[PDB]
Design a protein around this ligand. Sequence first.
Ligand code: HEM
Ligand SMILES: COc1ccc(C(=O)O)cc1
Length: 393
Amino acid sequence: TIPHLAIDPFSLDFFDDPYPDQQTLRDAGPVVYLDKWNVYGVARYAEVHAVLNDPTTFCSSRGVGLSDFKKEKPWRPPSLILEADPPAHTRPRAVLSKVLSPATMKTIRDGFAAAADAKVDELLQRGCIDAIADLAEAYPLSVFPDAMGLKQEGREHLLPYAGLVFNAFGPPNELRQTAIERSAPHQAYVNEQCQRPNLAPGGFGACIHAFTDTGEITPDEAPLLVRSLLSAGLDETVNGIGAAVYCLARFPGELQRLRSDPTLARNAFEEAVRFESPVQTFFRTTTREVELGGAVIGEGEKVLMFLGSANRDPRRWSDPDLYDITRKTSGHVGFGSGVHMCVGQLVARLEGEVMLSALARKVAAIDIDGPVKRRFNNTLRGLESLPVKLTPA
Ligand code: HEM
Ligand SMILES: COc1ccc(C(=O)O)cc1
């Protein structure tokens, strides 16, 4: 009943061009079996959306990577929120939703917008820049570590740790093992900055510690919650912004539209999050024998969700290979869906929007003048290098 496919969704051949293999996964059926790693796969929007919204059947406490925590020791102490299920997940989730609240976005927006404007001015002075290192990477590193109250020393560990977290969700390929080996320095730095005395007052980290008084979390849970904001929220926004810049380059007509109405910047970034989907895959583990789309999945089985393919499903999207800044992107699963939907989606959209706002008002054209290099990760899709030339507006 269930087709078995030999496609390796975590291979370098897959990462370089996943879209043909993704149609093959969608068209093979609503549930595929992937012999390479002995997991179930779902690639259509309908089934990816259904598993994300059935947390009781498709749990997260047994890991959201390939590894089954009930079977193997996790490479690090499990996340208090991403790798938890209700009710254990509920009160840590409420804390992060209040720390990263709409009320919190008002205190940082003008600081995040001003730094996005100054960065674009800075790169327009240099003309030919690397949109990844000098823009996609440079900007969020100039606002987010400060917004969390991180000290200046050691910030070079942040990106290496971020890419390690997402490589570790993957299978035991050499991408994951090279990242886990010699990961001790980044782990040591991140763990120490989780302690309250190292978090500047007013930042995200100190705010999370301030929530121990409420009875929502205890003091010993606070550092691990801080760890989530140092593991997630950097590498996804970098790839997300680098994709938007890449899209504006390959679709110059969309850049001219954003230039004519810069209030499209927030949706221009949202459509870029659907179009590229920086987080490409996440896992769930079955707690039951479940009937999924006419296909029976047993207990304790890993189910791989293809979020990027679900965002390009022609059964759900009109012309999904097209970048449309005016597309009604509502319902995409780049940020997830349900009880685990990104808790930091407001920070990402804010970072993305103010950058695309700055570009819309200062740049006339964005032209690629150099070899584009892909960045390879077990979980993230994004560019390694995007040589661009910016023409001032
Ligand atoms: C382009 C930007 C981003 C993308 C594409 C993205 C993607 C995702 C996705 C798909 C999930 C769901 C995981 C699951 O259901 O298993 C998630 C959860 C999460 N994200 Fe994001 N994210 C982004 C930005 C951020 C930011 C800015 C932060 C923090 C400041 C953040 C922190 C988190 C956390 C803590 C969770 C776990 C929430 C939970 O388990 O309830 N992410 N993210
Ligand atoms: C979606 O990416 C992540 C990665 C790590 C965590 C976490 O540390 O809880 C959450 C989300």
